[PDB]
Design a protein around this ligand. Structure first.
Ligand code: A1BW5
Ligand code: A1BW5
Lengths: 276, 281
């Protein structure tokens, strides 16, 4: 608990933040009273402690501009408050479902996600859940990853479809950083198709297809540019050794058609207007 | 309309105060999903356990298919953003993994489950997820079936399904291979549950879920590790549950008449197993 006292901040967070709106514990949106910065606050009743504290410690040291970044934490009575930056642009999922992203906007998102993965993979972190729900957007078009850990019963039934998982993860083989690269390729296909790859398809059937067919089938490849399809083929190489690393793919030609991140801002406005 | 499906779910349940009908709320062993508790009917003292398209189907299925061999749904409440009967003896998984049941004890459990399946199948409800984990036991030794989240309702106009739903290790061959299938996939899954009672585990549990599916598609009827330890009559009952030929596989009605079930012990014989399982926990 003395290390818990080494991470918590001095202050009453009820005084430093206002406009608490509710949206492993509850999640509020709030606003820094002194600067007006929007924040997201997660509240957790401590009474698997030791993991929570270790994670807080590694978050605060390994900041990165393409990761939803920790701000502070507070010991509030019996519960721990963890304060993150709030990204008000919403999730990539909303953008993907309400707009048709062009390849330039896709390349931009892919570059930003690959920068995050290079950072994480250099510190030996595996995200394991690279997918559109876990990509948050800022109102200036920033792109940041969320919902992963810095630090699954065979008897249980599958809910729902794990469409983002690499073949080596579905076969429950030990796996490494390249599973994120597979997931990113799936997400790029989702962006251009407007839907996750496996709908109308049962989870166990999807599991078998991921394991057997592997490199996912896309509708009408002739819709894609040759360089986008090459990029997808580098990401979705069933052979792990051949599959590109984050560092290698940051060099890929497809990323050089990326539009400025401001090009994402009209997509955000369109998504917000549609919901509702 | 992804909000019309929610609106339908709310309409199917009524608004009232649960805390004004049940008391003594206590967070029981919640798991993956969570929010499982125990309570006490204020008026009668009855002990209860309280926890979108699929949720709707399951609630509906439960309300219209009540039976002594099914964990009875008691009431539903809507407050802001499911009462069931409580079976203090725990799951059959705790028994099969921590104890060695004898043939009389196995036959008794199989009969109660076959009684459950005869009732569902005659009401055209296929469970599709039979396994020891969905068998709950009373402190008097009663055996009840739960979890209708995967169940299919069939008709004479559509009597078959083709969907890979269930839990791999227990799935029938015709489900794994996406052939049209009917109520007898539950019979197969009961036979796998009998193997659980014999060996402690369904076949291939050491394999991975996907490897296990391929092995079911390619082996068909699984092999007991030690068949010679079973009476020929138990061996026979098992063989009619795990028949590859759906036509030759026994129905719930036909298997309730099997001779293996004649050696069943009374349900009181299961309470020593429950005590062993609790102790083993
Ligand atoms: C266990 C210690 C690790 C840190 O623990 C947290 C992780 C993430 C978040 C979060 C950030 C966030 C930022 N921006 C937006 N904008 C929509 N939302 C956010 N959310 C809501 C769900 C995001 N999928 C969060 O939960 C929060 C509040 C806490
Ligand atoms: C999502 C669809 C609605 C679900 O509707 C329910 C289904 C099952 C149960 C349940 C009963 C129960 C009875 N008795 C005991 N004995 C301890 N436990 C029970 N549990 C705990 C897990 C059992 N595997 C339950 O979840 C409950 C409480 C609700």
């Amino acid at each position: 608990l003395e290390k818990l006292r080494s991470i918590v901040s001095v202050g009453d967070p009820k005084k430093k933040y206002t406009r608490f709106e509710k949206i492993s514990g509850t999640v509020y949106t709030a606003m820094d009273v002194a600067t007006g910065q929007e924040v997201a606050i997660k509240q957790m009743n401590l009474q698997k402690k030791e993991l929570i504290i270790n994670e807080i410690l590694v978050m605060r040291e390994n900041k990165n501009p393409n990761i939803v970044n920790y701000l502070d934490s507070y010991l509030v009575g019996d519960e721990l408050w963890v304060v993150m930056e709030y990204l008000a642009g919403g999730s990539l999922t909303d953008v993907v479902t309400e707009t048709c992203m062009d390849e330039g906007q896709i390349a931009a998102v892919c570059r930003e996600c690959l920068q995050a993965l290079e950072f994480l993979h250099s510190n030996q972190v595996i995200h394991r859940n690279i997918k559109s729900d876990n990509i948050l957007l800022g109102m200036d078009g920033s792109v940041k990853l969320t919902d992963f850990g810095f630090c699954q019963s065979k008897r249980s039934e599958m809910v729902g479809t794990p469409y983002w998982m690499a073949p080596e993860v579905v076969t429950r083989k030990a796996y490494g950083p390249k599973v994120d690269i597979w997931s990113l390729g799936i997400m790029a296909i989702e962006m251009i198709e407007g839907e996750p790859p496996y709908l109308n398809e049962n989870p166990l059937r999807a599991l078998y297809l991921i394991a057997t067919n592997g490199t996912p089938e896309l509708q009408n490849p002739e819709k894609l540019s040759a360089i986008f399809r090459d990029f997808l083929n580098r990401c979705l190489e069933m052979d792990v050794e051949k599959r590109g690393s984050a560092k290698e793919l940051l060099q890929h030609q497809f990323l050089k058609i990326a539009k400025p991140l401001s090009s994402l801002t009209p997509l955000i406005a369109a998504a917000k207007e549609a919901t509702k």
